[PDB]
């Protein structure tokens, strides 16, 4: 009998380019006269609700209604309130979501590691990892683009952020990608992007290639003598 | 005649050995596919992963005519014929299946319908499109299919040139015309042949140990068999699921269970099928 | 046609000599030594100890190898070391396999 | 009321040489009426738990489990459960735990990636990733050592095992050791050890340092003598 409301993380607003404010009802079957609204402090119920769900024997009838707002309004801590009025309870069900307050904004220092030499000796595949660390919030959305066009999400897995041991307020996240080793031998730029609020432009790109990690000079010293 | 005419020798670049890797390839490890949602559970062979396209990778941009386009694929086909048979010469096994599978894989790369996400495949597709002219997607796909169907003769003759530099006097085999069979069914057949050979070996071992003699070495043989079947079951599940999804679109695959499709046509030992039932 | 005099595995030297057969003439035919020695270029000085730095100076005494910590691993033999392992307060020393395909259970 | 049953990892099977099942009950009121015997597949039990603490940092109850089951039973995969006697729960709770049966055994590959040159230009910290590929099942044990003696667990952090992006049943593990930049420049050998059941010797070790991991130059003294030979 609780209407869970999901706050749009930075990954969602980055991937979908717009804002979604949703109200999902849990442990409640489908009844008529559904009344849901998104309201701020002074009050602007100026949006519509679409895609009403259907009953489920687990009683998770969503009754979801997505709200589209400006990007900076959500970042301004408007503290939107979702009030749900239904037949079971005449009193409105007030559940609220807001942008977190007081969180420090420390920009990530993304490091792109080329595949190891032991990767390439077996000639099976190349495992490029994208090391993202130093971000104090945990809103990380990492894509991979080759030659401009983004890669499929199936190739790369972005692990959930985990606490940093040395830095108490910072988190680290790693996103590896598995690609064929001969394609690495051909020579093609693989770019890993990181999306985060604390970045000056919320986008930082690093480029890896066959020639990023190479010995700059060779110091062969051939010494042949016929004496002992 | 059922042979090939005397073909001039062309320059070919060296390729890494197929047996150079100590792990000898991994069937389970798949690197890149077009999509793992609509094409789920399909396994790439080590042969496809080790498919050496070094010859065409050097001159995929300088090429400007279809005569060189045919000639360059002949050069890489000769290299594949040398590489596959030398690998199986040490293994003492017939290399005809590998030769025809490699030819079909190369032809599907020429089509652009090969079940791979190579940019090399995209580069060759763009080069062939600019060779014949640019049209709409379906039109250029059909034109490339027609061009490969017309020009596969020289490529396949080069393959038996590499075959007959070793076999010699014995007659050349027939084409068998499986080019209409797509990539995933051929990978299914290769996987079935490989896993059936390994089941033959492991079943021979477990019989020769357990049936005559519970010895500790026999228990180890049963444990190895259990480990291998546990490793190979998800592969069968994924490949059978893929077969069920792409079931209805050819006549040869109208036989309902995938195991009997493997059994009834070719490239199998008629021994084991790993059915969950 | 070449006689392999010495094939040491660690130095990975191949001491073999060949003679080029001359034409119909008095003998001035060329005698050669087909020695082909391979460097690891990334192995460490103490081949058994993984915690060694990189070795730069490779000393190849050709007369000595015909008949000294050795350079490259051999797939036939095992070069193994012991590494500590901890699950907590206790410390257990476990032998490890430095190279694959050499000490694999066969 | 929080309850968790933690399977013994292969490190607990190998290093401790004893299988210890723990069904921990935490964040609840204290009654001191805990008497739990680990039930086998049949009705009998093997051993009772030990060392129950009646205090918690947040002033609650913290419980632990303890037993000694033979390793052949775990190889058989018999189902085990932990039932509670402690009196806060009106009905005992059962947590069925067992080794999964039918899972594949792929040997992991231990791979070391040196710190990026961009990070080394900062000159404060150097991060090295011990990337493990193709192990099944998920349970993997990883350690970091410097020149043969182990490090504290706080220095290096390892991520939870996750499914492989493209492989069907394989898993990957990613572990990072954060050290100062000057230590990396001195050339100290940093090594990673991974423990898994599918390994040949159950332990495989790899070593990386400044000279090995993406070195800027190749310094080689190629000296030879006595080319005359005998
Ligand atoms: C460095 O090489 C030396 C040989 O010059 C070895 O040291 C001893 O090697 C023997 C035989 O393997 C072992 O039984 C000894 O325990 C080694 N000594 C010590 C102190 O461990 C070894 O190959 C290398 N040394 C080390 C410490 O790894
Ligand atoms: C290269 O080798 C020479 C002598 O062989 C040495 O003097 C020089 O310092 C080496 N280069 C570097 C960068 O150390
Ligand atoms: C490089 O090698 C030469 C000759 O062995 C040596 O004199 C020099 O000190 C070395 N330099 C470094 C940086 O290792």
From TrEMBL, chain B:
Disulfide bonds join 15-52. GO terms for molecular function: host cell surface receptor binding. Residues 41-186 form the Duffy-antigen binding domain. GO terms for cellular component: membrane. This is Putative erythrocyte membrane protein. It comes from Plasmodium falciparum (malaria parasite P. falciparum). The chain holds residues 113 to 403 of 656 of the full protein.
């Amino acid at each position: 009998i609780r209407v869970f409301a999901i706050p749009p993380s930075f990954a969602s607003i980055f991937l979908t380019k717009s804002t979604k404010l949703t109200c999902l009802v849990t442990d409640l079957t489908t009844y008529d006269s559904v009344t849901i609204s998104w309201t701020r402090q002074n009050g602007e119920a100026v949006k519509t609700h679409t895609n009403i769900s259907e009953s489920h024997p687990n009683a998770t009838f969503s009754a979801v209604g997505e709200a589209s707002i400006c990007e900076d309004d959500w970042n301004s801590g408007e503290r939107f309130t979702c009030t749900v009025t239904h037949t079971d309870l005449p009193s409105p069900l007030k559940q609220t979501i807001s942008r977190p307050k007081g969180v420090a904004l420390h920009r990530p220092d993304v490091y792109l590691l080329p595949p190891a030499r032991e990767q390439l000796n077996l000639r099976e595949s190349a495992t490029i990892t994208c090391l993202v660390t130093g971000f104090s919030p945990a809103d990380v959305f990492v894509q991979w683009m080759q030659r401009g066009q983004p890669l499929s999400p199936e190739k790369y897995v972005t692990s959930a952020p985990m606490p940093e041991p040395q830095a108490p307020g910072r988190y680290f996240a790693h996103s590896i990608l598995t690609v064929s080793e001969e394609e690495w031998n051909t020579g093609e730029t693989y770019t890993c992007v990181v999306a985060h609020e604390a970045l000056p432009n919320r986008v930082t790109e690093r480029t890896v290639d066959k020639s990023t990690g190479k010995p700059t000079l060779y110091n062969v010293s051939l010494v042949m003598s016929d004496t002992a | 005649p059922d042979e090939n005419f005397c073909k001039g020798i062309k320059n070919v670049l060296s390729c890494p050995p197929k047996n150079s890797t100590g792990r000898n390839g991994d069937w389970i490890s798949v690197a890149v596919k077009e999509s793992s949602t609509t094409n789920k559970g399909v396994l790439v062979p080590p042969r496809r992963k080790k498919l050496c396209l070094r010859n065409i990778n050097q001159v995929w941009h300088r090429i400007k005519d279809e005569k060189n386009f045919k000639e360059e694929f002949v050069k890489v086909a000769l290299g594949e014929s040398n590489a596959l048979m030398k690998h199986y010469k040490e293994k003492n096994l017939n290399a005809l299946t590998a030769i025809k599978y490699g030819f079909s894989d190369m032809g599907d790369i020429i089509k652009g319908t090969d079940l791979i996400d190579y940019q090399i495949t995209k580069n060759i597709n763009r080069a062939l499109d600019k060779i014949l002219g640019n049209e709409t997607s379906n039109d250029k796909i059909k034109k490339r299919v027609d061009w490969w169907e017309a020009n596969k003769s020289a490529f396949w003759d080069a393959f038996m040139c590499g075959y007959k530099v070793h076999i010699g006097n014995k007659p050349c085999p027939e084409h068998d015309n499986m080019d209409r069979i797509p990539q995933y069914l051929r990978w299914f057949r290769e996987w079935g042949t490989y896993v059936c050979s390994e089941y033959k070996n492991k079943f021979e071992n477990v019989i020769e140990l357990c049936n005559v003699r519970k010895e500790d070495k026999c228990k180890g043989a049963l444990k190895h068999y259990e480990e291998w079947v546990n490793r190979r079951r998800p592969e069968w599940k994924g490949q059978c699921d893929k077969f069920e999804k792409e079931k209805s679109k050819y006549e040869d695959t109208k036989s309902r269970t995938a195991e009997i499709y493997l059994k009834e046509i070719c490239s199998e030992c008629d021994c084991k099928y790993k059915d969950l039932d | 046609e070449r006689i392999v005099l010495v094939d040491n595995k660690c130095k990975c030297a191949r001491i073999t000599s060949r003679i080029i057969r001359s034409s119909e003439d008095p003998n001035e035919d060329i005698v050669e030594r087909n020695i082909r020695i391979i460097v690891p270029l990334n192995n460490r000085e103490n081949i058994s100890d993984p915690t060694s730095p990189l070795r730069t100076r490779f000393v190849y005494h050709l007369s000595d190898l015909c008949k000294e910590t050795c350079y490259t691993y051999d797939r036939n033999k095992c070069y193994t070391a012991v590494v500590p392992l901890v699950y907590g307060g206790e410390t257990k020393m476990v032998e490890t396999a430095l190279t694959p395909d050499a000490c694999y259970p066969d």
